[PDB]
Write a protein that binds this ligand. Structure first.
Ligand SMILES: *Cc1c(COP(=O)(O)O)cnc(C)c1O
Ligand SMILES: *Cc1c(COP(=O)(O)O)cnc(C)c1O
Ligand SMILES: [K+]
Ligand SMILES: [K+]
Lengths: 381, 381
């Protein structure tokens, strides 16, 4: 089902997932349906709306929530933009971010700091990979003017799974000027960690379909708890954001998460993500998949611990699919990732901390891991 | 080149254009390249950057401007959102829009009005299709606090091509608290009218690739004149919006239009738009295609004038590919458009004014028009 795995040794699922055949087929089929019936017509427009509804519903079931809490976007970042720009920011309001957030999210925060006179600071979580408590660290920085905390559930650089429940509790418990809310960047967590927003209390959770869920680049989504929807004012809007009157005039916002959806999107892509989501559900529960992922990452991590010139950032087994490490070599990590790609082995260079990252998915096998280990063994001081 | 045309009588290019074979081949080829070489890898990441540059350059050439003035988006609306959310609004600032604008664009204006305390007022252009002067109407509405004027170069409802150069002169001649700027919604104009932004002076021009350009749904763009770039602050941003520091940290805004590009997008669809753009240039110059479009629209317009129960809104030949008309019948335009679709004849119901719209492209032929005419003859009072 994942053709792309053959003839390469892929560990970059956290960059982009390998697109399954069923997903490509659905994308191709959707273009065919539009050619045959439209592309712009009563039949085609209806089919597109039915497809959007099917995808919204599939995402809702994925996280065990009502479809009205799901917004379809193009990527992780957009979800973050929706939440951040939607909040009614007042000068001096404060935003706390872990020191392991994505450059693009930081950039939104900076744009918002400059726009509403808000402030932001980082709390050190990187250092808690092997010790400490990121929740305790957060508390330590929580203030009276803190309004929003931004954190990645699974860190893209170190592979740490942040203690989300305790960080939420720490946040509820807090008594300040604002009820502290938490925007979660789920780029790495969604599709790898089992996520249930019924059993797990979340405020905002942005994710994408193109990484661990293995859908095509260009389709992602955003979860907003019903109790937080009101606080989020639509910002980028368009014809998909509203309801219409008798003369075709705007008459209010569309139902639930639809108000944050803009206008024409690559619909066939939606069918691709739908197919990819349905495939993963065909392969055991989220929990069984997560355990499969950890068994692969621990096997790789254990393998790396045995190589004399490789040093894993994690001193205990990885809590998810991300395994970061450094290599003792004059070459530098970029040259090593490049040479590895020369041999059709795909890993990623991490900018901070300066290291290399490997992603193991439930479709990764030991043979691919042993291959990586054999070629990594070639580097040294 | 446009397989979708056979076996239907399509007049809905203004809704979505028929996708040419070369575009579907480029889309498919891009998924294949990602499968073979990535999808996330040095080779794949470079191939995508090269693709984005090629598309940005082809758009730049289409409008005869420098690539730095072009932002790639997913649709017309996003271009309007970028400009509107980026201007430094102050309470009391006023926006004028024609009474023929898209409901989605009015929705952004109301959100801005609500967020920055600006005000908006409509000016009547719909009634200027056959008489009067849209620029003069705008002159009679310009005020002391007028900062921006929003208008569609080609009206999606009546098919009128507004006198843009004259409107620009009017705005530039006006003396008030602000240099009056103009945001053009080019959803119908781009890809049908020949547009040269070095000959035609323009401030902000939003467009999409999925209508007259015949690209796939999900890719569009925005033009911003070099002297206005400084006035548009980035709003929705992400990793594609910035320049980077030695440690992977954000250090500024990316060059030119890139500052308004966010994050992961439907890259194979970009190759699709690129191939469609190239196909049109191979058919003839923008001017030749425009003349062919008008030849078709006038032939259609003429035929409709001969039918006793059909009444074209335009009393002189259409200035572009859009031909709107009403039908004297107890059925109602929506029911008529549905009956036509049942016969695989594709038109669009217009909410205001209450009419039907047909779109003729350079690929439309006489047999299709005559067949449409044949079927409309059946409706009567
Ligand atoms: C991939 C990634 C993003 C960016 O994702 P897009 O889908 O391109 O927005 C954001 N954050 C983290 C932590 C990532 O790993
Ligand atoms: C079609 C259309 C739009 C909407 O285009 P999207 O690409 O879906 O944003 C906006 N304005 C006019 C005048 C249109 O005809
Ligand atoms: K080791
Ligand atoms: K007539």
């Amino acid at each position: 089902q994942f053709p792309g795995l053959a003839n390469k040794t892929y560990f970059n699922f956290g960059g982009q997932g390998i697109l399954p055949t069923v997903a490509l087929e659905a994308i191709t089929a959707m273009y065919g349906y539009l050619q045959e019936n439209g592309p712009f017509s009563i039949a085609a427009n209806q089919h597109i709306q039915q497809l959007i509804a099917q995808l919204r519903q599939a995402l809702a079931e994925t996280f065990n929530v009502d479809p009205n809490t799901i917004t379809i976007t193009d990527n992780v970042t957009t979800g973050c933009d929706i939440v951040l720009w939607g909040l009614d920011w007042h000068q001096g309001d404060e935003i706390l971010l872990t020191d392991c957030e994505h450059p693009g999210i930081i950039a939104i925060v900076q744009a918002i700091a400059a726009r509403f006179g808000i402030t932001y600071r980082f709390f050190p979580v990187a250092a808690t990979l092997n010790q400490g408590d990121a929740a305790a660290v957060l508390a330590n920085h929580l203030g009276p003017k803190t309004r929003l905390v931004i954190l990645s559930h699974l860190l893209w650089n170190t592979g740490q799974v942040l203690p989300l429940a305790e960080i939420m509790a720490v946040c509820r418990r807090h008594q300040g000027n604002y009820p502290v809310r938490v925007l979660v960047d789920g780029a790495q967590s969604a599709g790898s960690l089992p996520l249930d927003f019924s059993r797990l209390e979340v405020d905002y959770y942005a994710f994408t379909g193109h990484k661990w869920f293995a859908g095509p680049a260009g389709v992602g989504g955003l979860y907003i708890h019903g109790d937080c929807l009101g606080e989020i004012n639509p910002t980028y809007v368009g014809w998909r954001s509203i309801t219409y009157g008798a003369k075709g005039e705007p008459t209010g916002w569309a139902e639930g998460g639809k108000r944050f959806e803009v206008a024409t999107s690559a619909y066939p892509q939606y069918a691709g993500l739908l197919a990819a989501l349905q495939l993963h559900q065909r392969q055991g529960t989220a929990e069984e998949r997560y355990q499969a992922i950890c068994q692969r990452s621990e096997f790789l991590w254990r393998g790396l611990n045995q190589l004399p010139h490789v040093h894993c950032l994690a001193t205990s087994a990885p809590q998810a699919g991300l395994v970061s490490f450094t290599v003792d070599s004059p070459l530098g990590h970029r040259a090593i990732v490049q040479k590895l790609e020369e041999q059709r082995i795909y890993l990623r260079t991490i900018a901070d901390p300066d290291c290399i990252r490997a992603c193991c998915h439930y479709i990764t096998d030991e043979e691919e891991i042993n291959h990586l280990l054999a070629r990594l063994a070639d580097f040294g001081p």
